Amino acid sequence: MEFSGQRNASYPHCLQFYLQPPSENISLIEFENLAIDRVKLLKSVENLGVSYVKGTEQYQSKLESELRKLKFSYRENLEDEYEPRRRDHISHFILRLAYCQSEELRRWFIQQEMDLLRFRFSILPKDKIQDFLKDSQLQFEAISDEEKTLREQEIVASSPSLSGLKLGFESIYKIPFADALDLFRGRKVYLEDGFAYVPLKDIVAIILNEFRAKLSKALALTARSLPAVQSDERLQPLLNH
């Protein structure tokens, strides 16, 4: 037998890249606290850094508690996490203007963002990787995967860092040496005829690099185009102090 009988489209994944402007409304206290709580988070990431080494389980365990406490987006949930995702999106747009006040402050918050992104990419299950790589512009197509076992022999003979198990669990796909730039110029690993046998973390490095490029362009736009919006700026001193 065959039977008969909205915000999902906004953020199909917890990951987001700020292409679309949220064309809606906000309260004063709302945008204020949405940004200010994230200022606390930015400091907290580096406080955790001075506590102990970056990205360990101690980092992971404490960091998710920060997110649950601070009500922003998560390892992706199936219930209404779209509200935290749009809060994250909106508050990100709000955060562009505070620490654009100095390039050192820009670089400071960018660095904790890269750390946070690296953590999130470290958490990812396989299904997340499979659907986000296809649903994003971050396609990076694989070629002739059956050859990977000839490189299970060759890489293992040819690399100090990589191993046969990493061929499968850091699942190997073929893309150019230039997408593994630090690995070719350091000559660290098996690459051949200009092609690299690549796990996800190299594409994460590319994601971080293009994110930095696009964000830097946005910060330049923040420095230049913003004055029509600047009818109120009372929070800026409290934010830069």
Binding site: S65, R68, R75, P125
Partner: protein, 233 residues
């Protein structure tokens, strides 16, 4: 690796201060009395999260460990100093179990790894004696030490032990089938549960049914590792 999300479920269930705050109040009482086990009512868990509740009863072991870790993190978030006084925390269960309520006769091999609720009459006890969980050794000539879990000389004050006891439960004779003698089962009591029942008591025990290993004959002995013990009169 869904158990990290399962533990996450249990932690946000325990954080009930946003909704009338019953379990946070109970944990606060536990802290004030210096205790290290909590008793959870399965009806509340079933009401809040049907999936997690119906999975707990059929996967006793893999689910209870996640619940214990969630409790440890929650009490640590309340008070880290108190959380460091004990190695690990425990959780016990109460309420209505539906189809898992059995007797020493109706309990059979298909119940292995389910949470079960057995009742009957106590007939015997062994004596309380210690069991080792972590052992330590030290060297005064070098300020050196080593540990193991389950030259230098043993550190009884840095090592730690826990109590252990065995009891036996028998079927109610009024309920025996015609022309047969009553059946029985062996229960294991551990840590703060020892000596909570004596012969002639009528008890109802909650626990996980499990085999014990024994060349092998391919044949095992089954025992009920108690999780909570209750009395009635």
């Amino acid at each position: 690796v869904e158990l990290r999300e399962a533990q996450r479920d249990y932690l946000d269930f325990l954080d009930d201060e946003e909704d009338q705050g019953i379990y946070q109040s109970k944990v606060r009482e536990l802290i004030s009395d210096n205790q290290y086990r909590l008793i959870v009512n399965v009806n509340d868990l079933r009401r809040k999260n049907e999936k997690r509740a119906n999975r707990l009863l059929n996967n006793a072991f893999e689910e209870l460990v996640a619940f214990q870790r969630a409790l440890k993190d929650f009490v640590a978030s309340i008070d880290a100093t108190y959380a460091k006084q004990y190695e690990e925390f425990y959780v016990g269960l109460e309420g209505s179990f539906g189809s898992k309520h059995v007797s020493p006769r109706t309990l059979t091999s298909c119940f292995l790894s389910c949470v079960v609720c057995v009742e009957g009459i106590v007939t015997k006890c062994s004596l309380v004696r210690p069991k080792v969980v972590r052992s330590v050794h030290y060297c005064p000539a070098t300020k050196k030490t080593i540990e193991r879990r389950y030259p230098l000389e043993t550190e009884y004050g840095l090592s730690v032990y826990k109590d252990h006891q065995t009891i036996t439960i028998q079927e109610m004779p009024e309920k025996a089938p015609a022309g047969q003698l009553p059946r029985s089962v062996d229960v294991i009591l551990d840590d703060d549960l020892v000596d909570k029942a004596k012969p002639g008591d009528r008890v109802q025990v909650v626990g996980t049914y499990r085999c014990l290993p024994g060349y092998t004959s391919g044949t095992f002995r089954t025992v009920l590792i108690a999780c909570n013990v209750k009395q009635m009169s």
